[PDB]
């Protein structure tokens, strides 16, 4: 099988698809069972009727995944359902090649479990698994749509690339040199989709009735009508009256999912008996925890402190070079104007001689990363990087995850 398969293991959503395919196939990673006990698959969660009381179960814990059977079931469903996903169909995968993305700080126990499972259960001929950060320096191999933001202004792979991501689980700061991440200087942040969703739930429960039992609706609200402060918290607060939005809660009798109503536009004039919740302060207050954790009554440092610490740990020779090449990945960065505000804030604390540059993909960043590892698989360096099945059989199971795909090797 000359064209390998591209799989992105994500805590929230799983991105899988052949390297030939342009876009990944979106698939959630969770099992939802209603109050009555009826359980629904991840892809079938959006097809359910009742969203009032849902209990979410996923193999991915806060650090890594521990329940491998559920992950294996999800992978079997996603890989062997040609009817579910148009065109795609996997018969055996014996000769296929797989490129996987995992957590940059996965536990060695779970790492070896993953290696054994993928090598034996799926009978894959060759595999190359690494964190998403390693694949980013290979974007120079192809020409694509890339946006750039300058903080100061108002082989094929590149050695110098600072990669920052904000996933559903958490946020990591990774400095990468020569394509090898600098694990000593790697910094992490606990801010993630769960934190924002829970904070939105608590704020709405304080300003309205209690909806903490509802999570899908709050997640949809956050993904629809949440944005970061364009200039500062005070500027947004002063104009928060103008920047006011009203969300119509869905009615199970009529609509499964609600919609956002903007008072400025009149294209939705139809009345509806269902109540409407207005959102003025919460539109930008929740995203502000990235820069000002004190708003949410937490003592966490923040993104800028983490970036400064990571730069300080790095050798001084490459410190100015790192900020010149910064790329943002993850679903949390889909919020508007987040990248420009981040660039301005980081440039403010930087010395004058150093220029801040930020690169951001258009559209969802998860698809961008999936295309990134697909392009890496297309690269000739992948052929030398990938590990054969026979070599894994010859060596011990721990040798691969301690030498080739193990962060301890690069420590």
């Amino acid at each position: 099988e000359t064209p390998p398969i591209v799989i992105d293991n994500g805590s929230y959503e799983i991105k899988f698809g052949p390297s030939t395919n342009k876009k990944p196939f979106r698939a959630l990673n969770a099992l939802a069972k209603d109050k009555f006990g009826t359980s629904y698959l991840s892809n079938h969660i959006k097809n359910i009727k009742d969203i009032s009381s849902i209990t979410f179960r996923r193999p991915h814990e806060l650090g890594q995944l521990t329940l491998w059977e559920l992950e294996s079931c999800i992978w079997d469903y996603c890989l062997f359902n040609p009817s579910e996903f148009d065109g795609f169909d996997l018969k055996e995968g014996k000769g296929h090649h797989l490129v996987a993305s995992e957590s940059c700080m996965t536990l060695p126990e779970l790492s070896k479990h993953a290696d054994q499972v993928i090598f034996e259960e799926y009978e894959f001929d060759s595999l190359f698994k690494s964190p998403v950060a390693v694949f980013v320096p290979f974007t120079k191999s192809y020409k694509g749509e890339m946006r750039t933001i300058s903080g100061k202004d108002e082989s094929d792979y590149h050695d110098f690339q600072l990669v920052i991501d904000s996933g559903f689980n958490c946020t990591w700061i990774i400095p990468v040199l020569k394509g090898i991440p600098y694990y000593k200087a790697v910094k992490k942040l606990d801010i993630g989709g769960r934190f924002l969703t829970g904070l939105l739930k608590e704020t709405l429960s304080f300003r309205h009735y209690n909806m903490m039992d509802e999570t899908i609706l709050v997640n949809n609200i956050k993904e629809q009508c949440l944005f970061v402060s364009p200039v500062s918290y005070f500027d947004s607060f002063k104009t928060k009256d103008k920047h006011a939005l009203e969300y119509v809660l869905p009615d199970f009798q009529t609509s499964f999912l609600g919609y956002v109503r903007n008072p400025r536009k009149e294209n939705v004039p139809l009345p509806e008996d269902a109540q409407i919740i207005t959102l003025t302060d919460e539109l930008f207050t929740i995203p502000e925890t990235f820069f000002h954790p004190e708003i949410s009554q937490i003592t966490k440092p923040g993104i800028v402190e983490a970036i400064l610490e990571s730069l300080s740990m790095l050798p001084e020779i490459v410190r100015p070079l790192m900020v010149g090449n910064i790329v943002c990945t993850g679903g949390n960065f889909n919020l508007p104007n987040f990248a420009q505000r981040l660039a301005a804030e980081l440039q403010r604390q930087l010395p004058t001689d150093w220029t801040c540059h930020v690169s951001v993909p258009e559209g969802d960043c998860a698809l961008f990363g999936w295309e990134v590892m697909s392009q890496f698989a297309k690269t000739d360096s992948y052929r030398k990087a990938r590990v054969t099945r026979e070599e894994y059989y010859e060596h011990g199971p721990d040798w691969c995850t301690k030498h080739r795909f193990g962060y301890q090797n690069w420590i």
Binding site: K152, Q347, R348, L350, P351, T352
Partner: protein
């Protein structure tokens, strides 16, 4: 037309540097003072002789105040406290000023036009001197 250069921005830190050598010529003085300035475009540090340090000390400026340094005459004036510390206290006498634009140091010229009578009046009526 005259050209002037100005260092301005929020005061991050200031540090007197005292030489350990008496040298016989003086008893106790600071060799130089290092002050870092911050603005929107970036940050910069400076090294100042004791005269400017005495001036800024007379200006009564601590960390967190936006200041104004003129390179030509060494003039130092305190614009005010930066608005970032507005919420530091429930109430405060001091006004708050937004952080200035420009990196730290700017170059500019003034093309102010003045008639000779103003020159004669200024020469006849000086404004300098701190004498009673």
């Amino acid at each position: 037309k005259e050209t002037k250069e100005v260092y301005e921005g929020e005061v991050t830190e200031l540090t007197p540097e005292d030489a350990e050598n008496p040298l016989g010529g003086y008893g106790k003085t600071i060799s130089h003072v290092i002050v870092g300035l911050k603005s929107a475009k970036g940050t910069k540090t400076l090294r100042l002789d004791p005269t400017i340090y005495e001036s800024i000390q007379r200006e009564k400026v601590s960390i967190g105040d936006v200041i104004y340094i003129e390179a030509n005459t060494g003039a130092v004036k305190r614009v005010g406290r930066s608005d970032a510390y507005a919420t530091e206290f429930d109430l405060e006498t001091e006004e708050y000023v937004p952080l200035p634009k420009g990196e730290v140091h700017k170059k500019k010229e003034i093309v102010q036009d003045v008639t000779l009578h103003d020159l004669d009046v200024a020469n006849a009526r000086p404004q300098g001197g701190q004498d009673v």
